[PDB]
Amino acid sequence: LNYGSFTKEHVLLTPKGYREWVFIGASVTPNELNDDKAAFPEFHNVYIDPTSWGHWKKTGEFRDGTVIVLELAGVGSKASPSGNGYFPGEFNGIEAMVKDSKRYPERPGNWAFFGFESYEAKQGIIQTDETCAACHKEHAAHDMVFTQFYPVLRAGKP
Template sequence: MAQLKRTLLGGFAPLLLSGMLAAQVTTAAVAGEHDKHAKSYAHFNKDGDLLTPRNYREWIFVGAPVTPKDMNDGNPAFPEFHNVYIDPVSFAHWKKTGKFRDGTIIVKELVSVGTKESASGNGYFQGEFLGIAATVKDSKRFADSHNNWAYFGFESYESKSGAKQPEEACNVCHKDNAAEDNVFTQHYPVLRAAKPGK
């Protein structure tokens, strides 16, 4: 059996490798000249709800704000860690232009504080996944939203889709407080470092 597995793997490895190379070439190509028109990672159902993003943990990780319960009267608006990811094509566009393209999707995944001490010292260490929220920029679909960003809430990670939230529930705070085009880049060192022309 072990022998068979090795043979199978040996047989498939070159195939896998060439697949990966092809994928890299494709990514490089979309990230180039035509990324403005490249397909969005945001998908919608016919009611306009955002289909729950699935592979965002493999996108670009831009930061992890944390609003722990013990610093927010036990009840932060978004508990507790917020792991924030941007889709890779929009990140490439940001790197090149310093702008969020039409079709940008940013997911924040909520994670509990697991423990407050570890071998490294006292602090906040991530525990379990709690759910997600997301935002999408689209000048056609969300022509009426401030800066064309729409915000989506999801009942749980298992939900098929999430509903667009009212402008006052989300966009207003982002519009008033976020550093750049509704996005809290002041909390995302990865985006600041990648921005051109600093």
């Protein structure tokens, strides 16, 4: 069973309950290390939908219907009782990508990339290839997903 809800025009309605999907990794690009403004501010928490996670554990490939959600959060602080570093604050928004060779036959890897204007938006905004796919295609380790930063995925494949 596929976890996206889509319009007929193949646009991803804003996902709900993605925090109960399978987390695959977190990174941080702080503003202070990026001319005070990282491109994607400031802690990517990444989830894959449960059905595609099951397929991933079995095959090491992204199924048709795969939905991946990246959730942005602020740096809330840089020192805590456990030491110095980066610690999360408040949520900032989400981005998503969907693999579907049937909905997106002309897109690279059959991936559609979605930006979201806000958490209250009813749907994502499909992106042209120059805005997202070009970088992912050039640099992601496996099928346009940056699996070099997802140790859960790497440990879960057969």
